[PDB]
């Protein structure tokens, strides 16, 4: 399974000038393009080597499209300030995410197009790509507008068609990285908390994609108590890190096992002190 997603954030700046607009594009967990209204170029810019292959007509088109996106979000901020009866003095945020998933068969699986205002759900295209979830009465207005203008059908055409075609193109051109799994480099550390007890920490480093499961067992049985699972974090080189820890009685370290599941591992791994 693979995915292409674009993320858009616009922040209004009431003091002076137009909103801060940041757009980023991903294939799976790899960012491949960006636009920032505060950067010098005012172009869609590459963020992975495999997209740099694309010629001038790609970059001119994506720049044209991303700027049009920028203006839509500026106008949206104005529209929503009115709908919610807010003053011109406050800074507000619009967020939008859209894109497509393909399955193991490389065929269309799911499409998304959703929107938040000030970090709350506003409107979302539903899984059928034919109906809308409007969270409140402001969003219902947008829903009736979008249903009258047949926005869903236009989005469906992109999401089932063009979106998937771009994804397929990128997956091939970037296959060396995008279709390679990096299995986690695992090890365990030992931290003496007192004379009586110790913390075992199971590390998973340098893995891709980001999706991973770390679980502890005791004597072969799933243990939840006295564990601690950190949020998966980026290493900065395109891979990810995660750890899980368990506090144990000193001398009983051998009872406990860390279990690691990842797409890059044929069978799950087991570690033990």
């Amino acid at each position: 399974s693979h995915s292409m997603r674009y993320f858009f954030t616009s922040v209004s700046r009431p003091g002076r000038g137009e909103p801060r607009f940041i757009a980023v594009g991903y294939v799976d967990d790899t960012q491949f393009v960006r636009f920032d209204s505060d950067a010098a170029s005012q172009r869609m810019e590459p963020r992975a080597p495999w997209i740099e292959q694309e010629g001038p007509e790609y970059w001119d088109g994506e720049t044209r499209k991303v700027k049009a996106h920028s203006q839509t979000h500026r106008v949206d901020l104005g529209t929503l300030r009115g709908y919610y009866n807010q003053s011109e003095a406050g800074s507000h945020t619009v967020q939008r995410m859209y894109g497509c998933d393909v399955g193991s068969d490389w065929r269309f699986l799911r499409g998304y197009h959703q929107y938040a205002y000030d970090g709350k759900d506003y409107i979302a295209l539903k899984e059928d790509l034919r109906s809308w979830t409007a969270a409140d009465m402001a969003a219902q207005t947008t829903k009736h507008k979008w249903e009258a203008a047949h926005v869903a059908e236009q989005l469906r055409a992109y999401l089932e068609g063009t979106c998937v075609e771009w994804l397929r193109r990128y997956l091939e051109n970037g296959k060396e990285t995008l279709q390679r799994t990096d299995a986690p480099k695992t090890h365990m550390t030992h931290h003496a908390v007192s004379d009586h007890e110790a913390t075992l920490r199971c590390w998973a480093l340098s893995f891709y994609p980001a999706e991973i499961t770390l679980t502890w067992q005791r004597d072969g049985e799933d243990q939840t108590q006295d564990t601690e699972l950190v949020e998966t974090r980026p290493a900065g080189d395109g891979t990810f890190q995660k750890w899980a820890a368990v506090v144990v009685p000193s001398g009983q370290e051998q009872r406990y096992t860390c279990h690691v599941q990842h797409e890059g591992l044929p069978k799950p791994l087991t570690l033990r002190w």
């Binding site: 674009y6 499209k65 996106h69 929503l80 929107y115 409107i123 507008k145 203008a149 236009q154």
Partner: peptide, 11 residues
């Protein structure tokens, strides 16, 4: 590649 026409929330 981006959507050709983004819908505006106020039409």
């Amino acid at each position: 590649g981006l959507l050709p026409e983004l819908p505006a929330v106020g039409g």
